Design a binder for these strands. Sequence first.
DNA 1: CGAGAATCCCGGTGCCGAGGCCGCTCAATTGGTCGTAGACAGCTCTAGCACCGCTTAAACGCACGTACGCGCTGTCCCCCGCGTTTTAACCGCCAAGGGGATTACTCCCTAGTCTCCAGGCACGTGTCAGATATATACATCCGA
DNA 2: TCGGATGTATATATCTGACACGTGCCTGGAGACTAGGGAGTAATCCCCTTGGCGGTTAAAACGCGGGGGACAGCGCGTACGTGCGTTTAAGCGGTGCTAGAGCTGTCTACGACCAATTGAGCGGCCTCGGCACCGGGATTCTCGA
Lengths: 76, 146, 109, 109, 95, 96, 85, 82, 101, 101, 97, 98
Amino acid sequence: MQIFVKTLTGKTITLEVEPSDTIENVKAKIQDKEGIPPDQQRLIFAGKQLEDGRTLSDYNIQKESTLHLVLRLRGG
Amino acid sequence: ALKRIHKELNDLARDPPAQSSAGPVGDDMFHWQATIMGPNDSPYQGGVFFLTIHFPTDYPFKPPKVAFTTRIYHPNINSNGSICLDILRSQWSPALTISKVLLSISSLLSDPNPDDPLVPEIARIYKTDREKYNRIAREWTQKYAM
Amino acid sequence: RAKAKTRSSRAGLQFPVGRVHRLLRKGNYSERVGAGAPVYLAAVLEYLTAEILELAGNAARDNKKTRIIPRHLQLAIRNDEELNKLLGRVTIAQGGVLPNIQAVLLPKK
Amino acid sequence: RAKAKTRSSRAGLQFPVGRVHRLLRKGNYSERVGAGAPVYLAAVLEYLTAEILELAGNAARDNKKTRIIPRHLQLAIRNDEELNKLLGRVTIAQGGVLPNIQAVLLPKK
Amino acid sequence: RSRKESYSVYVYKVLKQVHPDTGISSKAMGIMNSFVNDIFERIAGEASRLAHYNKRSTITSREIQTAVRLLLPGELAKHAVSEGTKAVTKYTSAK
Amino acid sequence: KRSRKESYSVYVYKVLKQVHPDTGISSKAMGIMNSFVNDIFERIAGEASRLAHYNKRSTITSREIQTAVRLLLPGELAKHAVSEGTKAVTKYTSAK
Amino acid sequence: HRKVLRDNIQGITKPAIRRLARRGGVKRISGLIYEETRGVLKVFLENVIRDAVTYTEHAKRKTVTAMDVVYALKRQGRTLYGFGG
Amino acid sequence: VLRDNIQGITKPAIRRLARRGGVKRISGLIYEETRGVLKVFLENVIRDAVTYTEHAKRKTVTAMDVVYALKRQGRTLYGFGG
Amino acid sequence: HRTTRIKITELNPHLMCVLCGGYFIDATTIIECLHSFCKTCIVRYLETSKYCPICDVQVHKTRPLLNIRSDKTLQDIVYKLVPGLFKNEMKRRRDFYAAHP
Amino acid sequence: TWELSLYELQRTPQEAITDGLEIVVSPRSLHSELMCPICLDMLKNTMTTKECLHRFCADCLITALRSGNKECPTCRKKLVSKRSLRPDPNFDALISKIYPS
Amino acid sequence: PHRYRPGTVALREIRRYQKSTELLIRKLPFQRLVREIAQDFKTDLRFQSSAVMALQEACEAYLVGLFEDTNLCAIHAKRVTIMPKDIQLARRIRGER
Amino acid sequence: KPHRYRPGTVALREIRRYQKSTELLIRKLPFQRLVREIAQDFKTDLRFQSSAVMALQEACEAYLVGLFEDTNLCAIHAKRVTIMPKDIQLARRIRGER
DNA sequence: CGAGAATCCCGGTGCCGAGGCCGCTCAATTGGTCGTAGACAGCTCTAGCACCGCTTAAACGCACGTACGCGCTGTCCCCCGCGTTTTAACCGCCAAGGGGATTACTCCCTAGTCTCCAGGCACGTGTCAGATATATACATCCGA
DNA sequence: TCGGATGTATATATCTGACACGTGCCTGGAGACTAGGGAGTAATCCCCTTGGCGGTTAAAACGCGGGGGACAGCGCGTACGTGCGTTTAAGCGGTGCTAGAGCTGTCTACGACCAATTGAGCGGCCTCGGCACCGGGATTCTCGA
Ligand SMILES: [Zn+2]
Ligand SMILES: [Zn+2]
Ligand SMILES: [Zn+2]
Ligand SMILES: [Zn+2]
């Protein structure tokens, strides 16, 4: 479903992600839309981050929810 | 650098961010203090860590100085307290608020960036071992923070 | 007569259409100069000096000054990518250099 | 009349003083052109083509040929230090490159 | 004796529109005079070549649009073409 | 009607037959020699026009083409072209 | 009656870039060069074809002639010899 | 006749010109190199600037003759005329 | 303010197209002139011309689709100020695919 | 790409609402749209980017460009100067009609 | 069965193309570059045949001019292989980037 | 036991000092002696306007600062910190001067 | 120190482009007049050169120690060379038609001239922005 | 991991000279008019640009192996940085001289402009010799040993 994606500075993305999909599949869809690699991405729900092996159905993530993106710049 | 700070306090009192809090020390609207509640996926359970936030008086067009007052063993964090982020150092924008900075600090405690450390001898055993710092981060945070 | 107005007020400009027309005549560019040709130059020359004095006047307020100094002209020009392409083979006298230290030279953490 | 001779034979030249004079008139350089001005250009333009066709014709004899090819024009020009200073921002079509391999790339002894 | 023409009167008139409270020192008015003088010779220099290339003896506003499009980079050229044509169409109406 | 395009092709053959009377030039290298001559009009008459504007004069004379040659041509190209340009002008004070 | 011409930069093949490097006198060529010299040909060609088309837009022609390329390159300080002018 | 004035461009003056360039460390063989580069630069600009005074039949070298000699070499100054 | 209630009658022409005369749905703006229309308005209209239908500023020299970018923030003003278009767009869309699988 | 699919090619304009209907606007709903993300206040003299279509104040972008790096501060894209921005007067009248004065 | 050392055929190819004056880039896939890039400036542009050949001889002459300047960047970094670091110095000292 | 900065910190302090200021960095009297040596090879008993020598200081120092910005890039490319006379010759050749 | 691709050298065929010839128009030459650009001479006075004395900023010389340039070693990735298979460039041919040249006609636009007057330049004057000095408080570097 | 030392930004008062404004005067721009030709327009020719087949085969693409070169680490040593103390001469400011820049005025020789004339140089046509290509055999690096 349409889940909005917030960033730190304010990019908003319309993702069509089913709740059956895993969290790594959510990362791989931001590959094809903005070029961002998944190995830099963080994803936060109200204090709790997302593990890689889980899905979006564990946290009761309903329709029209918000993500958060924090970029892990490997080297600075 | 005076009127936008009044509305950040509206942005922190109406909806305070998770595992976070902030506010001024006193009459000075350029020296702030903040706390961090430790996350549960991290080896930082039983969190509280204090902060100091200094405004360069051309805010929001110069990155603020945020340092640690409590000692934290973590590869991208000095023994003096300065945080090694690419946000507050190089890649910064005037559209970032402190409430977005605190969520970028809270996410350092779960997973760091082990490719550019500050004390480089700490980040060596992260790259080879995993069972050591799971205990070290639980010993040195129950003493100097709890 | 009918109270001579100017050409540059008929164009809504401030750069002189009368001087530009006789600097195109005297100056050996062509045999003839069209009537709308100094109106076009005087409009382009306004809105290239207006676009520098915007940016130079903003750089004077950052240094808390009320006069434009030739420091502020290079801070205006060498911070645009498009005023650097006009003025890349141009040295501004007493303008200085943009402060740029490269990251290899800075001390290690 | 008196049997029109030319101007370029009065100057002892072969480049045309008559064309140079009307390319200085038609061409918008000045209002007036002096009488000794096309005589001076036609003499300078001879003895810059004569100094290239010396060196290009010598490079044609080294390749055992009797026609000047645009290979021989770059072998003439890029081997002078002074024809390189005129023609340093000039590419000659089908002229190629001087053969220069640098000594670091050659195999060790 | 021997009065000398410059563009200094018109740079102050463009200041008082843009920043009505700032001024310019005399060493930077001498630099703004040489911006204007050395962009005549760029624009009128290439507008004269375009008349010779096309075998014409007039420099019109059609040949100053393209000298601007050749010389000015990117969006300097877009805003100076648009504000050079707004002066010609305002000139030819008020005659 | 073909407009009778002018070039300097007749005058580059006449300078060959002085210099190398047994060689020729292909047509693709004549178009390059026609481009040397046209692009050195533009340099010399370009700077001779500026020397008249800088000094507030309306004539290009042989004085303004000496100093345009001295500005443009490097080193010993300038010395041999100034001397061989004044030898052609002084074949008018004796030959008018 | 164009549709679109699609890619055509991959037609600057890797053996064609190795030939151009060996007039430069190059022995060894890393594999990341071929992706970048295609991007430098874009910037050479886009700058010249901007100027060469604005010489034809205003001569009111529809063909880009050989002189319009010569004047576009002379305007950038890279003069061609052997095509007129 | 003046002699030996290239050495009046001292060692600490070149280190100031290097530190608008942004140079931390400077090897000791550079000061003889950069004096030889100012020779070649000034000999090219003064040669053209004098031939503008020679053409104008004038015995002083004015400020515009330097500006026209620099504009000819592709280095235009703003601030001294033009 | 705190409420600042308003009528639709003063909020019509900032939510109306010209090529259809209706509310913005998938609104795209021209980069040059910043006049907004629907996606099914401009993409049809710039198959024929190279000019904005409001102010006749040329969109692009050859292909006017390059200087068209969709404005997400102007849609979100249209869905919020008008009662029930995010449903009524989907209800018109879901009833379309009910006959065309 | 700007290829229309099947529903885009066979859709109808949704008409206006001309009957007088009050809109209960709430200021807890229009935060990310009418507010400048630099000064955290209402948008005034709005300048939108070309490539990104993000709205700021006029005196906030020009200060953010010369006192920082040359990017859109909410996209990290490439800005060059103030002339890669366009003022939107069709957005300024949304604030002056919803929130006067 | 028979192999040259790596670097000896490379020195042969430097001597082949520094003698020849032919166009090293092809001719049909480079009318297609010229006609893609010109799609953004006018529609339905024709080209003279000598207008595309003036563009190949300009583009080859200034890529060969680059690789002469990226040797010097590779050799002064004490290398033999050119890296894309070397194109970036050569285009920055020239004033292009 | 007396105060002593590490080598490199005063040098970075001077880079920030001179990239902030706009004055001329060569002394003005020994620069006039150059200009009047070099011009002796072209005419004798030449005079100079006072702004003709100052036009040559603005042009020469902008030329040398522009070189040292390019010899940094040639020293950092070779993984060094010192500029060297290798680096002047390499920047001056790619420009088209040697 | 021989084997094997590769580079040169030579003698022969074959074609097409250079070089010469010719008819002819248009551009250069002759001869002449006319107004003005520039050469020349005199004179005013600005500014460039020369000298002096004093203050003190900056260049110079020296010593010491750190840290960076540079040579050496080893490991491994990644280019080169080569052989095989596949793509499409190249060539020649044919055909249609857009559009580049060219002409002829006509009219609007620009130069040129005369007059009139106001915009811009030189010159003068007074006030405030900026520079300098002082005295702070705070930031930053570094040995212990 | 820290306190002393040095350097930095920051605030305040004083002071000078350069900016900005004003005034008077003159010369350059505007208004009005006329005349001639440059350019816009229409019609027409025919060149040359595109487009499409088809056969051939040079050149790209792919894959494999192995050696050379990039790159990181390490140790040594010397050359550059920092700094103190002493020497030099730049900088200022002042006075005095005169060369030469800059202007004015008079006058002539030079160049534009014109009309008539005629021969140089362009375009088209024709042809033979330079140069490319083929092919056979000398022969010169290259590399394993
Ligand atoms: Zn619509
Ligand atoms: Zn529009
Ligand atoms: Zn954006
Ligand atoms: Zn704002």
